Amino acid sequence: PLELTQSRVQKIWVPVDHRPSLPRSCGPNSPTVIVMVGLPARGKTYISKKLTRYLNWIGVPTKVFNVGEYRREAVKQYSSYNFFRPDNEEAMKVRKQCALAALRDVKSYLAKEGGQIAVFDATNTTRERRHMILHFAKENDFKAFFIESVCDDPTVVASNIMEVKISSPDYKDCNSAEAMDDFMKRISCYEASYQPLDPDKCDRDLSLIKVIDVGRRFLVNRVQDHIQSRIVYYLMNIHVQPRTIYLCRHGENEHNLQGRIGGDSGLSSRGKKFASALSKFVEEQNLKDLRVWTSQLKSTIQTAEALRLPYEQWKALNEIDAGVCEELTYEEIRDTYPEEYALREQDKYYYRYPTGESYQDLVQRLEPVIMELERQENVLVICHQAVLRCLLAYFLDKSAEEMPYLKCPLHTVLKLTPVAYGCRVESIYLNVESVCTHRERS
Amino acid sequence: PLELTQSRVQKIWVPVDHRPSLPRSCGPNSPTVIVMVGLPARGKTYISKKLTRYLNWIGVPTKVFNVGEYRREAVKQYSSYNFFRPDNEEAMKVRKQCALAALRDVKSYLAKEGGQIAVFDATNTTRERRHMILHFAKENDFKAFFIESVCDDPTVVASNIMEVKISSPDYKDCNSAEAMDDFMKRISCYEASYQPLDPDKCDRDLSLIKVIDVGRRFLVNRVQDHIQSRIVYYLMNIHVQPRTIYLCRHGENEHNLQGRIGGDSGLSSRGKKFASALSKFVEEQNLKDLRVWTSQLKSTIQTAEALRLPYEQWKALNEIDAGVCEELTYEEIRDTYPEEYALREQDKYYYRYPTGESYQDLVQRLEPVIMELERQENVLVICHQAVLRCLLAYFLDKSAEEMPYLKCPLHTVLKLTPVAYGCRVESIYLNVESVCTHRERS
Numbered sequence A, B: 001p002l003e004l005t006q007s008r009v010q011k012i013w014v015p016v017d018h019r020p021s022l023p024r025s026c027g028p029n030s031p032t033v034i035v036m037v038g039l040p041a042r043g044k045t046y047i048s049k050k051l052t053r054y055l056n057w058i059g060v061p062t063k064v065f066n067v068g069e070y071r072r073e074a075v076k077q078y079s080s081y082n083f084f085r086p087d088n089e090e091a092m093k094v095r096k097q098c099a100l101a102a103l104r105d106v107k108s109y110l111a112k113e114g115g116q117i118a119v120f121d122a123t124n125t126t127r128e129r130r131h132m133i134l135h136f137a138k139e140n141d142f143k144a145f146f147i148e149s150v151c152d153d154p155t156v157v158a159s160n161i162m163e164v165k166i167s168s169p170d171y172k173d174c175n176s177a178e179a180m181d182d183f184m185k186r187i188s189c190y191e192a193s194y195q196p197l198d199p200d201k202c203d204r205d206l207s208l209i210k211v212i213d214v215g216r217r218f219l220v221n222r223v224q225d226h227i228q229s230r231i232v233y234y235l236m237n238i239h240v241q242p243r244t245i246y247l248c249r250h251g252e253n254e255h256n257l258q259g260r261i262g263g264d265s266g267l268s269s270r271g272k273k274f275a276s277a278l279s280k281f282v283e284e285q286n287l288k289d290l291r292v293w294t295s296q297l298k299s300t301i302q303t304a305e306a307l308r309l310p311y312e313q314w315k316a317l318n319e320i321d322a323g324v325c326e327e328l329t330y331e332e333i334r335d336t337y338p339e340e341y342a343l344r345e346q347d348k349y350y351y352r353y354p355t356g357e358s359y360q361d362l363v364q365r366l367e368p369v370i371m372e373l374e375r376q377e378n379v380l381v382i383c384h385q386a387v388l389r390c391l392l393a394y395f396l397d398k399s400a401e402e403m404p405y406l407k408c409p410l411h412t413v414l415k416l417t418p419v420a421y422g423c424r425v426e427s428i429y430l431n432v433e434s435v436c437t438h439r440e441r442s
């Protein structure tokens, strides 16, 4: 009666499954199609890629289906905006076939591949196209959530999104000025038939968000569930202003010298030298209003103390909890807990230390850190190896499987700069020796 | 160089403060005035009270300033809607004096009493009144965030908010029908001069949210900071649909019998009897679609197993981490760590166990649980003593100081029902003996 067993890897209590003579599998919430809406150069691909990066990182399987990519596959080389003319009978047919092909892949992804969210990245500017997408969702038992981006021409031009748009393989054999001229003519092709979302009348029953003038205003209609509410919250926190994110670990500590994990030890003499070298590096960057964040552990706070700048301590930035393995060396873990050591090496992301955490737990703890990092401008985060791997996996779009093996050395600053649809990463080693704490996969 | 000391109560690393011969104090982000906007019976007081309860619980000091309460103090007894007539020269003057008096208290609260958010709960239906509030905020260096609730007359009548409105001390000497008739006439007094927020033109530079038809739609203009974004997210998660929240602890466990704290022990024979009694109680409630949540600790999961219902395990519901004091009795804590025992007894909310948590840490961990509980309908939460005190403090509007002493006995269901501007709490003891784990303040 109420007999449970603790799963070996994740440490989850589950009922003892004394399967009968013929074990049976019950193989395998409703998936959602996010429908992007709007004229070209309205940041729909930027939104698609950002939302997908956030949703995968929090653990919701998401994939983007870009109709232009299907088009590039079906039509060898792009010559001009003439392909997008509303009187181009042949190209109109090809473009519709590409949208139907992408939708066939959306169905396979959500109904058969274990996908939870499909982002349908296309203009979807007419009521006819959107009615067709709603029919596809209704017949497959998928929810539909529309994200429209509306922006006037001067704001689009000032935003510099068209420089990202003309970097497409469509403009491989073009100079910047002619690609820009062609893209402008392409936008004009969509203007006459564009029917914006109308929540007052025709679209009153649809779940949607209109992002107006690069986030200056939002219209939200019929939020149905938690993921729609969360997406709205995420869209209100992100921004396109230029800034820099700096990520580093605390300076080398006394536990690092002994090869000991966790704990709350202080900086070693080298760790103190790195903290000084970090202050000099920060001064040389000459940043406007740098925000500095640390964990609540001693080594990060001593590192921030050398900067002579205000800083905020976050408990969410504390290093992964090793539970019963806290303050042990990896050799002491292998000898005292050999089964635990082998299970972690085999499933490092999902493995939970006894009475401790997994990288999967770290992601959940770190989500408010990520949300606040999106809102901020210049930020320096002084943290710890496993925490840093998690944050870096979010910015660099790394999977759960690669996250626990990302290289984050001591005394090295990782400088992140927002470029196109992601981050440029520059590594800056501050020339202070330390031990190596990186352990490659077995 | 980089010399730190760990604070005794909160365990925060701080620089050693070797104060000079003449110790100096630097005594003592910009506060916000939330401006409610709209006709009477639009749920402005419901929103004011809900937001204030959430903001105080997460640790942002918030207070509501209701102009009607200042009016009731200045004018002994309410006779009728004639007091709210736009041609009532005397009452118009008194009403303006009450709004100015409430604003004087907003200034004192935010500039001198350590308040962070003041909710200005009044109609504020004219551009003149709102311009005056904007001048007050601008001259005091306060931010202004407007929350307007717009709803048509049939939707207001169907919502049943006017039954809450007529329960006011204004209608103490009235029967339900005449109070309802008077309140209807009162609303009509505000209609001719009502100038709704206009983000397209006149209010384009204001930070605001329009809540349309009891949350069916939202208009969000110029979100400035994290607390505005968070309020929008909270407003998208709450709802006014009827439902029930049930809160209880796991059945008595083996650590409870030994007087031991924390750990991951299983149910005792009495705890198993309570789990059976809980299944019978749940069956007798005859609820539509009950969601069941547990922690990831054994005792709550064994309790949920007796229900024969699907359940979800949340790591955020795990009991407070006692760090180095895990699995000790309170007598073993007093004898091994006498200084730690005395510090906790003196500051129970802020006290952090070494390598463990405080109730303040629990609130931060539990915020996504609260957000999801707001979204749901019927829910049963099977958790632990300190976690349950935190959740109960949110629903019952209890302060941080009283939260660690709330009575949450074993084998007892706390049934929460939404009524007016809060929760009705009914206690249901399931007639199964157990130890007592409650410890009163010293």
Ligand SMILES: Cn1cc(-c2cn(C)c3ccc(Oc4ccc(NC(=O)[C@@H]5CCCN5)cc4)cc23)cn1
Binding pocket: A041, A042, A043, A044, A046, A047, A149, A151, A155, A156, A159, A160, A161, A211, A213, A214, A215, A216, A235, A236, A237, A238, A239, A240, A420, B222, B223, B224
């Ligand atoms: C990388 N990049 C994207 C753009 C871009 C251009 N245009 C015309 C766009 C339109 C929408 C767009 O996507 C968003 C832009 C902004 C926001 N959110 C915000 O700006 C929030 C609200 C107020 C505070 N911050 C959310 C989405 C991004 C763009 C420009 N550069």
Ligand SMILES: Cn1cc(-c2cn(C)c3ccc(Oc4ccc(NC(=O)[C@@H]5CCCN5)cc4)cc23)cn1
Binding pocket: A222, A223, A224, B041, B042, B043, B044, B046, B047, B149, B151, B155, B156, B159, B160, B161, B211, B213, B214, B215, B216, B235, B236, B237, B238, B239, B240, B420
């Ligand atoms: C307790 N109670 C309040 C009302 C009420 C009446 N009227 C006319 C109101 C208008 C607004 C109001 O406040 C909100 C009502 C709803 C929401 N949010 C929502 O409904 C979200 C969005 C979609 C999913 N759930 C946020 C605030 C509440 C009310 C009725 N009973």
Ligand SMILES: O=P(O)(O)OC[C@H]1O[C@](O)(CO)[C@@H](O)[C@@H]1O
Binding pocket: A256, A260, A261, A262, A263, A319, A320, A322, A384, A385, A386, A404, A437, A439
């Ligand atoms: O997941 P990994 O590779 O064991 O790295 C995390 C470890 O790295 C450290 O930050 C440094 O050794 C430890 O405190 C922590 O347990």
Ligand SMILES: O=P(O)(O)OC[C@H]1O[C@](O)(CO)[C@@H](O)[C@@H]1O
Binding pocket: B256, B260, B261, B262, B263, B319, B320, B322, B384, B385, B386, B404, B437, B439
């Ligand atoms: O904050 P208090 O009053 O010590 O109660 C929390 C304690 O109650 C228990 O849930 C039961 O004794 C312990 O596991 C936990 O440490």
